[PDB]
Symmetry: C3
Amino acid sequence: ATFMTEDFLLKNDIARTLYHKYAAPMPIYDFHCHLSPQEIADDRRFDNLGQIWLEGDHYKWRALRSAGVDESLITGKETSDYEKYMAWANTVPKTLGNPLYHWTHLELRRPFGITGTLFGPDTAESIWTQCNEKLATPAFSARGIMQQMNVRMVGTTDDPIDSLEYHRQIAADDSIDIEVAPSWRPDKVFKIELDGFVDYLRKLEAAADVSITRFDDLRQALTRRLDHFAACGCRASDHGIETLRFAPVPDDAQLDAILGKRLAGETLSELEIAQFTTAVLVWLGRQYAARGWVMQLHIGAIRNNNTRMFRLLGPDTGFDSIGDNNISWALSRLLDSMDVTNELPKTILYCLNPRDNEVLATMIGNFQGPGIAGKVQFGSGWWFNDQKDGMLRQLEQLSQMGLLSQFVGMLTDSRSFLSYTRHEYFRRILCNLLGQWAQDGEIPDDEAMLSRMVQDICFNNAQRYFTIK
Amino acid sequence: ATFMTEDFLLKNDIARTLYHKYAAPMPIYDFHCHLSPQEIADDRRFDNLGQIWLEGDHYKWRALRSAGVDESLITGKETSDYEKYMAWANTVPKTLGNPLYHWTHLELRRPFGITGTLFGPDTAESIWTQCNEKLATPAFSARGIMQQMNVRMVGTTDDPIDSLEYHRQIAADDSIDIEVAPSWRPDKVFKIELDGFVDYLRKLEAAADVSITRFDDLRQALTRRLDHFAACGCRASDHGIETLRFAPVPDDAQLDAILGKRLAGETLSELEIAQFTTAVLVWLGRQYAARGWVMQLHIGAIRNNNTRMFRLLGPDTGFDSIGDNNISWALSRLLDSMDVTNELPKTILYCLNPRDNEVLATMIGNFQGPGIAGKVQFGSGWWFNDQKDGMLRQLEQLSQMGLLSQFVGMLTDSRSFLSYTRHEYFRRILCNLLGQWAQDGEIPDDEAMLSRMVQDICFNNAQRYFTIK
Amino acid sequence: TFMTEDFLLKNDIARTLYHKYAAPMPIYDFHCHLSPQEIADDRRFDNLGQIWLEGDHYKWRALRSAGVDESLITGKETSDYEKYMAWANTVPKTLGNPLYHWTHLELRRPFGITGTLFGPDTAESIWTQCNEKLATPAFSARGIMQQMNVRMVGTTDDPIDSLEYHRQIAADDSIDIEVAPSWRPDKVFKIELDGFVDYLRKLEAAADVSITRFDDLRQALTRRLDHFAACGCRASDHGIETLRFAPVPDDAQLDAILGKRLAGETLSELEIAQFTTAVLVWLGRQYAARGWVMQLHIGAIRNNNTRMFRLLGPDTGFDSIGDNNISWALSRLLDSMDVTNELPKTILYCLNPRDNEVLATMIGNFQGPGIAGKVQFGSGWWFNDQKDGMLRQLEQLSQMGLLSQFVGMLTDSRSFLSYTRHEYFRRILCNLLGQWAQDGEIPDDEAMLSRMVQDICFNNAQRYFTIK
Ligand SMILES: [Cl-]
Ligand SMILES: [Cl-]
Ligand SMILES: [Cl-]
């Protein structure tokens, strides 16, 4: 009868208590996101609701396209923000069942305080005006929203060649107590088979002041950049792996020969690509272990599927989807290559194809370590899987194959300042899961035990895990 | 507790209202099936219940074999319809949990009007006699059943070499107002690696009255057959793909060489097979786009697994199952090859292996288009997946990754006139899903919005989607 | 309340099915890894830690995940009580993990401990109580088997084994539980493994046959199969991590391959597939001729941690779920035996649940007459042997096959405390059937439902494993 009350997704008494008493009030340790550091440093003020909300994480764009809306009303420079907004307002009523319908109303509730009203053509104009007035105030600036949402720390995703000037600016600014840490994402460095590898390498050379012609030079350059990240507060790395490969690491003469061919423009064989890629990832893994950083592996996307649209809009514009390569063998050999010398760092594994949930949940158990709780983690439902069904399936496998109690938990993985309600969504789902289990007599209804678990999964595990020990 | 009441599968009050008030009265647009056009044209009168029930869809055959029944009582020319029917009667009580138990009772209920009776040895005799008396009347002929089940349109699956004479006969016959459209299924044309390719190509030559030596001759022959299909009311195509391949389309000289080699009995390399198959599929896709037809891709079957039985019974006799090749890369390249020139048609994708559900639900989002609600669709649970669990999983991924509101819906994919209860089954499941979401406060409990959605998924979406723009 | 007698039973029909029909049925643990010598000598356990800690390596994996030092897990240096306390400190961290259910299920049966959560505050008392019980005859290896109403077990043995403890148990009137050996010839067909030559020499000595050509291997295996037959065997098992297939070549090629292996030469993928397929097809025909059940356990990725393998060896908790594509090879392998109508009774198991539907539909391609479900889709295996895993396997079997003919549950365990896994399964099954009945999805007919419960809990397996 009532849509999205304050007990949204809470279907039993234990769930309501867990959520309202132990989960909801915990701060957010958003260890992995795609927020713009300059927007945080400059404390961006948004002109209107379309501007802060529309692009989001390209889910709206995908929904608009699916609904048949012309691209001019989605990414077009020839239409106003208000027009793009009305197009979205006409589309939301068509999203029932899609998490977009939930996110939209969660986001209008927090931080905008709009409740008891469905977003659509008949309410859009009023919602636009009310939100625009709020957006004109300091509390609703980029920093303001982060503070209202109780954000304690965020980990941005950055490239080795970045200056991290905005991170330093934020660190040096006492008017903001939220920690904004950069994260090392060297994708371009290990994907030697991609067309832009050489161009990127030249940028790395200038960034590190190293002439890169031998593999060892690459190690030198990467060490310099790793040192820069360290100095700017980096505690984690990330790796977007679309094609997970593995080949035992050959000697430097062979790695030099591979780099040489690539620089000359010669086609590399799969073996050579696997060899180079594995050499870099293993060397990087050892560095992360030595520095006490968390290594994140985001595996399985298939990107830029639409050539016509890629030519007009470029990457990360809503044309990426789920890949389906076999991965257990390569994953196992890759992790083991680091662990054999006891140089496997704290590691978080994410799979974009949920058919791999059990592979990952069991894979982490092969490489755990002493003195730390859950050294190797199976990450929260990622991207397309960051929704109710997706999260329930991830949580179920982590629970059955590992230890839910030691789960680092949720992260927004978002470039939007309105994404913090994704933590609320996750928390409600987790509390309902635990509540249902307890109510059904599948776990004790000992509130002391459950409250501790909820607090840990919602924040304490993450904060502890990301500490450079 | 009572088995299969009129509220079967409807577990909440909202579900009951949606189903009984809005879903049940909707007509059926069975846009993809395997019904015999000749049986529709001649308005076949079945002699008995065994005949109309046991000539297919092969699910019964598989259940009978699993129960240890001799093949002679399943497909044998030697046993009578009544003896085969009794073997089935003795087996139904062993099928609890299998959708066969549901179909059997749904079908006796509609169209036969038999309720409150479990089918098995004790009741089979009476049921046989009662159904035989009804089968002898016009309301229970092939067309009669379709009329009783409120079928307004059907899309049969036909080969390019087919005359379509029965489709013409039905079109010209004013005593039948149900539209029976043919669907273009050119499997044999693109599966160049199969033994019967050359014999098939000769039949295509005969049907088109075109000599085929070069790849361009194949385009000419196919163009003529496409026009024949268009003139007989075709608005759709279908493609059964067991081995989804991809290789960039080479120039005609290469395609001619591949065809030349094949016609000479020479063995083709995997690259050559991929090139030819891809060239045919891409060209066909473009033709479908230019004509405004829907393109269906049914991917993943592993066929004729039992050689001993294949030699005695041939293909499509219940020895096919779920395959598991990796498909995202080939699928992406194949669709993008059509979409790059903006020549991708309305497309529906189906996967036989549910592990690929999320791959497909997300793949469709990469290629949507303007002016149509859900240009690319993720099809209803197919074949083995056309059951409660399978459909709930397919619906969940479509809901989460796409827009359920634009879903074209259910299709029987059957050769049996008693398959329309599969729509009843789908509708009850859908209504219960929406109802449960509404009741749990996950979607608004707004009868105007929900009923419109139910009606759209039950019929309106398909009617609009299959209309040539 | 946590784990009452109605644990996992959410409706009245389920309660009736479980308490009145499932629970009283005896157990036919047709596949396990129990030590026959422990059964023969009726092993007496010194303490709770001893009988419980190693189990099936699930506890070791949880301990490592919790950050517990390896010396307190597998170290020969620390005591049983220290290891036990480490485990007591870890159990409260396992909510949501089946370990929490097993722990408490095992304490209830056979130990009689109820209404208390296992943790640091209750561990010492539990240790003392359980130890007093372990000191009595009723809690010896055989005693526990009799307490859990175990009627038959199928051990997992290697072709070169003597099976002397099987012959001893059979000759002993004090024990009426049947303990049959099962033939697991993994080392024979996995030619690519380093230890293949050394193993072959053990087979040569066991069968007293000089193995130089492929036909010699047939003779050697035939003698061993006969030995196993004379010792009561009626089932086989095959652990297949890399499911291969290549058409079986003639003996000249098979001889050449075997020759290259014995001479230390490296084999190609085709060569390995040829040899492996020829051995599996030959064995399959043998199983068919003898009326034995053929089990295929597919999809493990083993010994993933080199550093730990070097210190502890295999089966120490460092194996996980593989993910190779298997439908094509599985189909051609089964078809290679079925083409001459020589496919035996077969149970298929997949370690990766994404393959549930592949297996559930694959079995339907090779069913046979005069038998109820010749080819079976096995219960959730290993990692999948838990509530979610079992429910998913049951659902696919039900949707694509015939649940009524399911051979049912097996522990696949080396622990005498594993019989509660049967209890767990039975509760889950009864609740599933009960929920369907209550929702009007199946008839609420006690006669039909009870029959089905008893068949799945014991009758189906007893008939299925009968050689006839
Ligand atoms: Cl978005
Ligand atoms: Cl059928
Ligand atoms: Cl264990």
